[PDB]
Design a protein around this ligand. Structure first.
Ligand code: CHL
Ligand code: CLA
Ligand code: CLA
Ligand code: CLA
Ligand code: CLA
Ligand code: CLA
Ligand code: CLA
Ligand SMILES: CC1=C[C@H](O)CC(C)(C)[C@H]1/C=C/C(C)=C/C=C/C(C)=C/C=C/C=C(C)/C=C/C=C(C)/C=C/C1=C(C)C[C@H](O)CC1(C)C
Ligand SMILES: CC1=C[C@H](O)CC(C)(C)[C@H]1/C=C/C(C)=C/C=C/C(C)=C/C=C/C=C(C)/C=C/C=C(C)/C=C/C1=C(C)C[C@H](O)CC1(C)C
Ligand SMILES: CC1=C[C@H](O)CC(C)(C)[C@H]1/C=C/C(C)=C/C=C/C(C)=C/C=C/C=C(C)/C=C/C=C(C)/C=C/C1=C(C)C[C@H](O)CC1(C)C
Ligand SMILES: CCCCCCCCCCCCC/C=C\[C@H](O)[C@H](N)CO
Ligand SMILES: CCCCCCCCCCCCCCCC(=O)O
Lengths: 229, 227, 39, 213
């Protein structure tokens, strides 16, 4: 059985039943059954959101290289007002999140379509709706679940790297990759900063502190700039 | 019985001569704990091999490049072509990643003996690893382990201890005279009564700090000598 | 500790602490409200 | 058997190693009585947690002050916050005393009567205020991750880590107060001054700690 540390003993609460189980829990956060049940859904939702976000950022830079993703919320103008879009998103997200939360706390209780009584999701597990949500499932379910959780973890780390690279270099993912490929020995984080007992140098925050959006002055500070190496 | 580290001294109970190069020397009793003894043996082997490599590197470097000081060879401007004036960040990144991988593998081997012998990518590529700190196989392609491994291990630990003492000697000689081991030996051979530890001591030739490209690295001697 | 608290509960120690508290309260009142003659 | 504060001396009879961070340190026998010891355990836990929060906040603000972020020192942050923002100091004091009074009064009456706050008289909540042990209030509110209701050995290890970190944070807060009273600068400023010259920039050369120096 593959593990995050070959030759180590996995935790007792991690028996390898859940997909993506590699015996990684040094803090013992998943020891409780209810906590593990909640964290499983949290990881699945985080994985899917990060996967969609990373794919969207890459496609955004490929299709629109002149638009920075970090500035995408500012330099995008639509006939629909920002407050109207926020209201639409709030209502739709509230509806779907309440339905998902109710399915989590009460399994097999919101599988029925409230509009049409002839549509109902078949019995499933928490975090894996299926039915109308899965019109095509090519391959084994367990193998695909492992692939999904692994791709989701990679995408989560990728989004964190996207944010950090955008705050340190001020460029997109493809732009940062090209900049690093041009001079690999002088573009890493080690080449940009270093800390010693006599001096502590950190890279400057390329993101401006304030952003003017229709006369509102939205503050945009780099994530934990003081703790930057 | 084996010869101890001193005439008339009594070896400790835990030092029965099982390990190579055992002289019953433990004035601090640090080897009383078996787990601590195994960890200290691994640490001694690592120090021995690294010190042997350092001593050989300093000697070969002084022979091939006598115009380059080994103490200041770490500066980017003293690096050979085409690594001269290279970015130290990328170099540190390369070393950190590679050394971190190999040291984590070695550490896991120490925690769980015989559990990381197999290659994680190409299955079937394993090392025999008869004892801790002695992997063998790909690490010994010439096959010198199929014989008296005890005397060879004794030779290795003794040469490593001698190299540890020698490397510290090189460091103090460079910090007190400002020259390499061969240069210090030649200087002492020129006038033994004029160039020795009686007059070279008390002076620290190492500067206060050095500006490596952009950041400054503080430096100091092992003893409070005159800067 | 029980015996020490019992000793502190004796009449002279209790009287000393109580009178020190009462005197301190009166002194602080006269300090923050100097020369009070009438209500 | 267990390590004590002063090696060779037997630990006191009222300290048997059951509590977290037990090293038999009680030369004045302050916690000799069982009820007094229980009260002191809760006091030490509260002190350690408050000191941990204070030390972390002081270190973070000092880090932001050392780099060009505009953060103020810990001994001037209160004045800077009250003057920069239109915040009335007595109003903030009253609000904090109200919230702290409610939380501390509930904790106090739970100490006097264990499990009494679980009756449901506070908005119907019952299991969230039952309390696991003295000074360790488990539940879904104080422990949402459930690290205290799973892997008992890990829970005991975390208890030892918490009490030791709390004691270290208390010593750190005392050090912050003494360093500001002596040198007059921030804690990271003292750390940088010491790293610049450790042989001549310390408490033995500040001119305040040792008056005969
Ligand atoms: C998961 C969602 C999400 C994320 C990660 C971001 C991330 C970002 N947005 Mg959006 N946004 C998001 C959703 C949305 N943004 C906007 C509208 C805007 C605008 C108008 C702007 C941004 C800007 C920014 C950037 C600066 C963030 C900051 O410091 O905010 C600080 C403020 C908060 C964190 C919000 C307050 C607290 C929150 C919990 C409520 C940043 C890269 C700014 C930019 O371009 O900067 C360069 C900018 O001007 N976003 C809308 C409405 C359509 C969103 C709807 O979901
Ligand atoms: C986390 C998901 C996510 C989010 C928040 C965004 C957000 C944004 N994208 Mg983007 N995108 C995404 C995923 C996402 N995208 C993915 C996965 C792709 C690959 C197909 C793309 C490809 C893409 C392109 C090519 C472009 C953007 C652009 C933009 C920006 C303005 C466009 C807009 O929203 O107007 C409204 C968008 C529409 C009206 C299109 C129709 C909306 C469809 C029909 C909704 C489909 C819903 C879907 C089935 C449900 C999946 C939900 C899932 C994410 C959880 C905006 C900040 C534009 C930009 O760069 O700004 C200048 C731009 O050109 N995106
Ligand atoms: C782990 C021990 C060790 C370490 C840390 C070093 C470190 C170093 N050696 Mg060295 N060396 C060693 C062992 C070691 N050596 C041994 C055992 C030998 C004998 C074969 C040599 C023979 C040697 C020579 C002949 C030279 C160096 C040089 C150098 C310096 C430049 C690095 C380099 O060559 O570019 C990178 C190397 C590769 C990419 C491969 C560097 C500080 C060079 C120097 O003097 O710098 C000016 C040089 O000319 N070494
Ligand atoms: C063992 C007692 C002893 C002690 C306590 C000291 C102490 C001192 N010596 Mg000294 N020294 C000693 C023995 C000792 N020495 C002997 C036996 C010799 C003859 C080899 C010397 C030769 C010597 C020289 C040439 C100088 C000093 C100097 C100094 C002073 C500066 C510290 C330093 O790093 O210099 C040197 C450190 C050492 C010599 C290490 C001592 C090794 C001992 C023997 C280990 C036991 C310092 C107060 C320096 C000074 O006078 O300051 C201006 C200086 O230049 N010493
Ligand atoms: C029984 C005799 C007597 C009486 C009636 C008084 C009465 C008074 N004395 Mg006096 N005094 C006396 C004997 C007496 N003294 C003696 C024997 C001495 C020598 C030790 C002194 C020496 C003395 C000094 C030096 C001073 C007074 C002062 C005062 C006035 C202070 C009022 C006060 O304390 O504020 C108010 C007290 C309270 C509000 C406490 C209330 C208790 C609780 C907290 C509230 C409960 C209430 C419901 C007061 C009118 C002071 C003064 O200013 O004179 C005008 C003052 O300076 N007295
Ligand atoms: C009990 C310990 C403690 C105390 C007394 C303080 C006190 C203070 N902190 Mg601090 N802090 C602490 C712990 C503490 N902190 C810890 C553990 C951390 C994480 C390491 C931080 C990180 C931190 C940062 C980053 C900042 C402060 C700041 C401040 C000052 C402004 C008040 C404030 O927080 O704004 C307002 C209070 C709130 C926003 C709380 C919201 C109330 C909620 C919504 C009610 C529900 C104030 C003097 C700020 C400062 O430096 O002043 C300029 C600042 O930016 N703190
Ligand atoms: C909207 C006002 C505001 C402003 C102008 C700042 C500004 C700053 N904060 Mg900060 N912070 C804020 C709100 C704010 N904060 C709030 C409400 C919290 C509680 C969650 C924090 C908690 C916080 C921490 C823990 C730290 C900072 C730090 C910093 C400094 C480094 C840049 C940074 O933001 O890293 C980003 C850090 C974040 C936690 C991002 C959260 C801030 C966004 C805008 C959300 C706030 C919206 C809120 C709901 C209204 C910087 C000067 C760092 C510092 O002190 O330097 C040493 C630091 O470590 N802040
Ligand atoms: C359900 C269903 C069913 C039916 O039947 C059908 C259908 C409809 C099809 C469906 C759907 C699906 C979906 C949605 C999918 C998606 C996915 C994704 C997005 C993934 C990603 C995923 C993603 C991922 C992993 C990502 C990754 C990334 C990465 C690593 C990155 C990296 C980087 C960085 C950091 C930075 C730099 O500068 C660059 C680089 C270097 C490059
Ligand atoms: C046993 C015991 C126990 C009992 O109980 C007690 C007592 C007595 C305490 C004891 C003893 C101890 C001792 C003696 C110790 C010592 C050690 C050492 C010397 C080490 C070194 C060790 C050493 C070492 C590792 C070293 C290494 C080195 C190196 C790598 C080098 C490198 C280099 C080179 C090449 C050159 C170039 O240019 C640079 C560099 C980079 C610089
Ligand atoms: C045990 C015993 C018994 C026997 O028998 C005898 C003897 C020996 C006496 C003993 C001992 C004792 C001791 C040591 C004690 C100590 C304690 C402490 C230090 C505490 C602190 C403690 C401390 C603490 C809490 C602290 C806390 C802190 C805090 C909150 C802070 C805050 C803040 C901040 C953030 C910043 C801003 O800007 C300001 C402020 C606002 C300021
Ligand atoms: C617009 C009205 C919104 C609500 C206004 C404030 C009401 C807040 C009251 C919270 C409910 C407190 C009691 C909660 C549960 C009760 O204990 C149950 N009946 C159990 O006995
Ligand atoms: C600035 C001061 C504001 C004072 C705010 C007081 C808020 C109520 C405090 C009441 C505490 C009562 C504690 C119970 C006493 C007891 O248990 O004996």
């Amino acid at each position: 059985r593959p593990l995050w540390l070959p030759g180590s003993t996995p935790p007792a609460h991690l028996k390898g039943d859940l997909p993506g189980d590699f015996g990684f829990d040094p803090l013992g956060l998943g020891a409780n059954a209810e906590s593990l049940k909640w964290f499983k859904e949290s990881e699945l939702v985080h994985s899917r959101w990060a996967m969609a976000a990373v794919a969207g950022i890459l496609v955004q830079e490929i299709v629109r290289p002149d638009v920075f993703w970090y500035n995408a919320g500012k330099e995008v103008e639509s006939p629909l007002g920002p407050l109207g879009l926020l209201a639409v998103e709030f209502f739709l997200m509230h509806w779907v999140e309440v339905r998902r939360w109710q399915d989590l706390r009460k399994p097999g209780s919101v599988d029925q379509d409230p509009i049409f009584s002839q549509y109902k999701l078949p019995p499933h597990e928490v975090g894996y709706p299926g039915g109308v949500f899965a019109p095509f499932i090519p391959g084994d379910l367990a193998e695909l679940k492992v692939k999904e959780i692994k791709n989701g973890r990679l995408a989560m780390l990728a989004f964190v790297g996207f944010v950090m690279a955008a705050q340190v270099t001020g460029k997109g993912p493809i732009a940062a990759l090209q900049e690093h490929l041009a001079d690999p020995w002088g573009t890493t984080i080690f080449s940009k900063a270093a800390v010693v007992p006599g001096q502590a140098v950190a890279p400057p925050c390329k993101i401006p502190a304030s952003v003017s959006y229709k006369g509102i002055e939205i503050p945009t500070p780099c994530f934990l700039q003081g703790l930057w190496p | 019985d084996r010869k101890l580290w001193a005439p008339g001294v009594v070896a400790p109970e835990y030092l029965k001569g099982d390990l190579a190069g055992d002289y019953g020397w433990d004035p601090l009793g640090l080897g009383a704990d078996p787990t601590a003894l195994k960890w200290y043996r691994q640490s001694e082997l690592q120090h021995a091999r690294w010190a042997m490599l350092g001593v050989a590197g300093v000697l070969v470097q002084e022979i091939v490049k006598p115009d380059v000081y080994f103490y200041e060879a770490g500066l980017p401007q003293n690096l050979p072509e085409p690594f001269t004036n290279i970015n130290m960040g990328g170099l540190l990144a390369w070393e950190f990643i590679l050394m971190h991988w190999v040291e984590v593998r070695r550490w896991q081997d120490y925690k769980n003996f015989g559990s990381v012998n197999e290659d994680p990518i190409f299955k079937g590529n394993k090392v025999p690893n008869p004892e801790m700190g002695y992997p063998g196989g790909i690490f010994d392609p010439f096959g010198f382990s199929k014989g008296n491994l005890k005397e060879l291990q004794t030779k290795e630990i003794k040469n490593g201890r001698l190299a540890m003492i020698a490397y510290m000697a090189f460091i103090l000689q460079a910090q007190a005279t400002g020259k390499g081991p061969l240069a210090a030996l030649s200087a002492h051979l020129s006038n033994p009564f004029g160039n020795n530890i009686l007059k070279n001591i008390g002076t620290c030739t190492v500067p206060h700090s050095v500006d490596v490209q952009g950041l400054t690295i503080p430096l100091t001697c092992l003893w409070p000598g005159s800067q | 500790m029980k015996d020490f608290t019992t000793y502190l509960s004796t009449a002279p120690v209790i009287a000393t602490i109580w009178f020190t508290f009462t005197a301190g309260l009166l002194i602080e009142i006269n300090r923050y409200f100097p020369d009070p003659l009438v209500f | 058997v267990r390590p004590v504060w002063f090696p060779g001396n037997p630990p006191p009879a009222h300290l048997d190693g059951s509590l977290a961070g037990d090293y038999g340190f009680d030369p004045l026998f302050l916690g000799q009585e069982p009820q007094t010891l229980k009260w002191y355990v809760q006091a030490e836990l509260v002190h350690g947690r408050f000191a941990m929060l204070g030390a972390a906040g002081i270190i973070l603000t000092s880090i932001g002050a050392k780099v060009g972020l505009g953060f103020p020192e810990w001994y001037d942050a209160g004045k800077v916050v009250v003057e920069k923002n239109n915040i009335d100091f007595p109003t903030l004091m009253v609000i904090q005393f109200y919230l702290m009074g409610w939380a501390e009064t509930k904790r106090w009456y739970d100490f006097k009567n264990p499990g009494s706050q679980a009756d449901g008289s506070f908005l119907g909540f019952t299991e969230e205020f039952k309390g696991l042990e003295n000074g360790y209030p488990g539940g879904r509110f104080f422990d949402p991750m459930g690290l205290s209701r799973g892997d008992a050995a890990k829970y005991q290890e975390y208890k030892q880590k918490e009490v030791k970190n709390g004691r270290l944070a208390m010593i750190a807060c005392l050090g912050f107060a003494a360093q500001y009273a002596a040198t007059g600068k921030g804690p990271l400023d003292n750390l940088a001054d010491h790293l610049a010259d450790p042989n001549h920039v310390n408490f033995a050369t500040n001119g305040v700690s040792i008056p005969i120096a």
